Specification:
The structure is cut from a larger assembly and holds 2 copies of chain A and 1 copy of chain C (313 residues). With 454 residues, chain A is of the alpha/beta class. Helix content of chain A is 29%, strand content 19%. Chain A has 12 helices and 20 strands. Chain A has helices spanning 23-30, 47-59, 78-81, 98-105, 111-130, 154-161, 174-177, 197-211, 280-298, 315-324, 400-409, 426-438; strands at 2-3, 5-6, 12-13, 19-20, 41-45, 92-95, 138-143, 169-173, 218-219, 226-235, 245-252, 268-270, 304-309, 330-337, 345-346, 357-362, 365-368, 373-374, 379-380, 389-395. In chain A, the strands form 4 sheets. In chain A, strands 2-16-17-20-14-13-10-11-12 form a 9-stranded mixed β-sheet, sandwiched between helices. A 4-stranded parallel β-sheet of chain A has the order 6-5-7-8, with helices on both faces. In chain A, helix 5 runs parallel beside helix 6 (154-161) and helix 9 (280-298) packs parallel to helix 10. Chain C is an alpha+beta fold. In chain C, strands 2, 7, 8, 9, 10 and 11 form a 6-stranded antiparallel β-sheet that branches. A 4-stranded antiparallel β-sheet of chain C has the order 4-5-3-6. The longest helix of chain C has 19 residues, at 153-171. Classes of the chains: A alpha/beta (454), C alpha+beta (313). Chains in contact: A-B, A-C. The interface between A and C is large, with 45 and 44 residues. Strand 1 (2-3) of chain A pairs parallel with strand 14 (305-306) of chain C, so a sheet runs across the interface. Chain A binds a DNA/RNA duplex (19 and 20 nucleotides) through residues 67-68, 141, 148, 155, 159, 169-173, 176-177, 192-196, 199-204, 207, 233-235, 242-243, 272-276, 310-312, 337, 339, 371, 381-387, 414, 416-419, 422-423. Chain C: One of its GO terms (biological process) is signal transduction.
Amino acid sequence: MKELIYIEEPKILFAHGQKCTDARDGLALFGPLNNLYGIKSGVIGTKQGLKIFRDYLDHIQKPIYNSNSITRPMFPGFEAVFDCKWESTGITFKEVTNEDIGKFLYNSSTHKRTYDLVSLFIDKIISANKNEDENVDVWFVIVPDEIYKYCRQFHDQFKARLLKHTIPTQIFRESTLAWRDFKNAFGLPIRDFSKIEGHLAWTISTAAFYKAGGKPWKLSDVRNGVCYLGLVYKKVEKSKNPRNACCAAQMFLDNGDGTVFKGEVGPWYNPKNGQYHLEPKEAKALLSQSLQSYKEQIGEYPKEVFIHAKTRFNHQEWDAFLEVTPKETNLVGVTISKTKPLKLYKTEGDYTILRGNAYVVNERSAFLWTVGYVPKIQTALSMEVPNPLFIEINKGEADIKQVLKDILSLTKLNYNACIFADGEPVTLRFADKIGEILTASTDIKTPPLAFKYY
Amino acid sequence: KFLYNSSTHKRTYDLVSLFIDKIISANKNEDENVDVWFVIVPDEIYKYCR
Amino acid sequence: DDINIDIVRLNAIDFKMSWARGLKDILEAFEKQKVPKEVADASKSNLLYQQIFLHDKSVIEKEEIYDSNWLSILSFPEELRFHEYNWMLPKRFDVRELTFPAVRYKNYLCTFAWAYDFTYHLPKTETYHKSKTIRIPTEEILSGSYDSNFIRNAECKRLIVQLLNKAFELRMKDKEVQEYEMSNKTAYWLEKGKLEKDKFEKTMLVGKQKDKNWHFAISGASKLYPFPVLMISSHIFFTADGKKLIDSSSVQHSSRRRQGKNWWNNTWRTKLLAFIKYLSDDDTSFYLEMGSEEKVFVSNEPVKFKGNVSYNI
RNA sequence: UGACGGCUCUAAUCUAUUA
DNA sequence: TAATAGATTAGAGCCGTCAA
C-alpha cells in the first residue's frame, strides 16, 4: 500500500496571451507566437523530387482530417494556422541528376559513397547560397529511397558539414511525401498514413515553420532566475580508439521576455574509455561557458542551476562545478533514468495509468509518469504498459516535487514534433541530437549553437 | 573604449570587431531569420575611420 | 465600480482568464436560448465545436488503486554466516554447482545455511569448527547500522542480492518451468499441458496465433531499493510447435511485436497475476531456499499503489 | 530527418573478491 | 594479467502508430 501524488499539467503560451495544454489545439485556436510573412523554399534534388515536393505543398494548403479527430486534431491548413504563405511559388530548385547518384551509389565502399553524396549535396547548396541572388529561408533536401536506405551516417555527416555556413536544412524522403504512390512490390503502402495524414502535416508544417525563424509556442509556468542544463555523453568511432567520451550539452534559461532555449555546445572530451565523467578542467570550462551565457544575456548570475544527466556524477567534477559556481548560485545536479522496471497496472481494465502520477520514494528520489493516459486526447501515449522515469536528486538540495514539476514542464518544448508531450525532458533530447550531429565530422570550430541548424 | 586610441588601424579594427562579432553571434545562435542586417553607425565613427 | 450602470445587472461571460472557456460559455448560452444556426458542412464543422470546448481535466478524482510487479520481502532469516574455509575449501572450485547457494569470499563461504549443509559436496568439512564461522545479523545491516573494515555494508547488500538471485534461479529448476537465455537475464515460462491446455484462474497463459504458439514468460530480479523487493518483467516468446523454440532473434522480435499489438493493460495485469499465482507454494506466498531451516518467504501479491486523482471512459 | 514510443541484441566501465 | 557477481552505461536494429 503505497501512495501516489499528482502534479498539474503545465500550460504553453500561444498568440495574444492565450494558454492551452495541447500544441496542436493551441495552434489551431490562436496561432503561433510570432508572425512571419512567408517561407521561401529552396529545394535540392531530382525533377521527380521537385514534383513530389510541389504536390505535397499544394496538398497541405487545404484542410486535412484524421480518422478520429479527438485523438489526432485536424490540420486546418498552413495559412489557416501559421498565417504565413508557404506556397509552391517560392520554390528555388537545384537539379541533382539521377546519374550522379548512380555513380556515387553503386560503388563498393560505404564511407566513400556517403562522403561523395554529402559532398555533392552540400556543394550544390553552398554554391547556391554563395553565388546566387535568390534568398532561401529553408533548404529542403528530398532524397530518394536509395540513400537513406543504402547509406545509413549520411544525415549526420550532411548536417555536420553544413555547420560552417549556417544553412537551415530539412531532409525528406520521397516515400514520406509520396506515401500513396510509394507502394511495395505487393501494391500496398508500406507507409500507410491515410488515418494520420493530419498528424504528418502538423509535424512537417511545425518543423518547417520553426526552421524558418518562427517560434510556434512556449511554456508559460517557469520561474525566473533558474537555468536548466542537460549533458549527454556520446562515443566517437572515427578516432583511433573504439570510443572516447564526448560530452555535449543543451541549455535553457527562462528569458528576459520568453523561452531562451539554445544549447551550451562545444564538445568536451574524456579519453578514458567508458568514463562518462568530466575532468575538473572541462567541467570548469562548461560551467563557466553556461554561466557567462546567462550573464551576458540578463546581466546577473542565476540563483539556481538545475543540471540534468542520464548518468551519475562523481565527486571530482561536482567539486569542480562548485569551484567555478559563484557563492550566490544554487547548484542542483539531477539524474534521470529509465532502466528501472516499475509498472503500475490499472485494475479496472483497458486503459492504462493516467500520465502525471508520481511515486515520491523519499526526499531525494521519486518516480514520474511523463508518459501515460492523457484525459484530453483520451488515449495512452504508449502501446504496452508505460515505464516511468526514475528522477533522483544526485547532488545538491532541492524539492523533489519542484524537480518533478520542472521535468514535466520541460517535456513540451519538442519543436521537432507536434505531439501532446514527450517522454523525457526535451533538453536532454536536443543535447543528444546536437552531440550526434557534432560527433559525425571532426572539424567544427565554434559550432553554430542554435537548434534550427541541427 | 575603442575610438579614443591613437592608431587609426587599431580603432577601426576594434570597431569592426565589435560590430561583426555581434552580428555573427546573432546569426549563429539565435532562432530568428534576419534577411538583411542594417548597421546604423553614428556620425562619429565613419568620420575618423578612413 | 467602473462598469457602466446599463450592463451591471446583466450577466457577463468571463473572457479574462481564457477565450476558449468564454467561447464555451457563449455556446452554452446560445444553445440554451435557441439561436438560429445552419450551414453544417460535409467537412464536419462539429469537430470545431468539439475542439472549442477548451477541454476536460481530471476533476473526477476517484481512488483507483494500482498494482505492480513488486513482491515485498517479508520474514528474512535473522543472520547470515561466513564459514572460514581457510584451507578446507579447495581452490579452482566454482560455487555454482553447490545445490545450496553461496558466494565465495576471501577465504570463507557466505551463505544463510549452517556449516554442514554442504556435506555431500565437501565431505572433508566434517571436522569444521564453529568458532571459525562468523554470523552477521540481517535485520540491522539493512537499516545501515553496520560498519566494519572486514566488510562493507553495501558489499553485504550486494552479496544478499547475489544469494537471492541464485535462490530464484534454483527454485524454478524443480518447478516444471522452461528457461530461456536472453541478453543478460533468464526468462522462465510455462509450457503446454499442465493447464486445461490454457488457463490459470481463468487466464490464457499460453495461446496460439495464426501459425505458431505464443507463451507468456516472467523474469525476476531481487533488489533492496526503495525496500527489499522482487521485481518482475513480462515477455512473450514464440514456439513453432510448442515443444521446440525458434533460435532466431529477428523472427522472435517480429512475432513479439505483432502479438503485443493488441494486448492492453488488463491483459498484461491478469497474465502477470496468473503466472505469479502459479508459483505459489502456499495460499498467500511462496518460499525460496537459503537455509535448511531458514527460508525467505515472498508475498504472492504485488505491492499495490493508491492514488486520489483518476479518470473514466 | 516526418515524429514518438516499446522491445530485442550487442559491447564497454566502476566497485568488491579470487587467481 | 582472467574468473565471478552487481550496477551503470551507450549503441544498433526493428516494429507500431488504424480498425480490427
